[PDB]
């Protein structure tokens, strides 16, 4: 699966990549249809050995971020909704002659410093979907924060 490698920083940090690295969009003609569609992002509680038993963006309650301008109000009782202020999820625009895996630019902006971990960690799996008019295609990916052990680290 796709692993997004994030270098821990003391400042905010934006990340641009193509949604169809994550979402099963299909061939190029299908990706071009998806270019103008909205995307959404769901944090998951699955690990590497349980990926197949926690389906991603399975209900509306798992959606914490969307590429819409109006900001998505997460589910009050979803435990991972607290991650909401740490991430902004936006949609880019692609040229009309866009090429494979380059018609759906999205941006993940980590709004907090990352040298230390957040109380619910950002280092986890995430689901991504495309707001389409048939069954939304849904994929997942791993957000991996780099680590560098300190000198006094035991
Ligand atoms: C995030 O970092 C990991 C490594 O910690 C990347 O995983 C590895 O990515 C490389 C690059 O695509 C994959 O192939 C590589 O090919 C080069 C040929 O120059 C070779 O020198 C490397 O040793 C490696 O074989 C590799 O399959 C993949 N997995 C492993 C275990 O290395 C990952 O790609 C990075 N994420 C992104 C978005 O780049």
What is the number of domains present in the chain? 1
User: What is the rounded CA–CA span in Å between residue 74 and residue 62?
Assistant: 8
Within-domain flag for 153: no
This entry's atomic model was obtained through: X-ray
Within-domain flag for 103: yes
Distance from the alpha carbon of residue 142 to the mean position of ligand 1, in angstroms: 14
The atom number, within ligand 1, closest to the CA of 144 reads 1
Within-domain flag for 129: yes
Cβ of 5 closer than 6 Å to ligand 1, yes or no, is yes
Distance from the alpha carbon of residue 3 to the mean position of ligand 1, in angstroms: 10
Residue by residue, DSSP assigns the chain as: -EEEEE---SS-EEEEEEGGGTS---SHHHHHHHTTSEEEEEE----TTTGGGS-TT-SGGG--EESSSSPP---TT-GGGGGGGGEEEEE----TT--TT-S-EEEEEE-S--SS--SS-S-SEEEEEEE-SSSPPEEEEEEEE-----TT--
Cβ of 3 closer than 6 Å to ligand 1, yes or no, is yes
Range of the domain at 20: 3-145
Cβ of 16 closer than 6 Å to ligand 1, yes or no, is no
């Amino acid at each position: 699966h796709l692993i997004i490698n994030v270098t821990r920083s003391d400042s905010p940090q934006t990340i641009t990549f193509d949604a169809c690295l994550v979402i099963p969009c299909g061939d190029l003609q299908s990706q071009r249809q998806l270019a103008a569609a909205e995307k959404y992002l769901c944090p998951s509680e699955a690990d590497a050995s349980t990926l197949f038993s926690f389906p991603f963006c399975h209900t509306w309650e798992y959606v914490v971020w969307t590429t819409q301008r109006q900001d998505w109000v997460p589910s009050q009782d979803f435990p991972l909704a607290v991650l909401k202020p740490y991430i902004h999820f936006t949609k880019g625009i692609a040229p009309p002659n866009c090429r494979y895996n380059q018609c759906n630019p999205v941006q993940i902006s980590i709004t907090i410093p990352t040298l230390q971990d957040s109380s619910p960690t950002l280092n986890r799996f995430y689901g991504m979907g495309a707001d389409v008019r048939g069954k939304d295609p849904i994929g997942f990916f791993e957000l991996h924060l780099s680590t560098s052990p300190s000198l006094i680290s035991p």
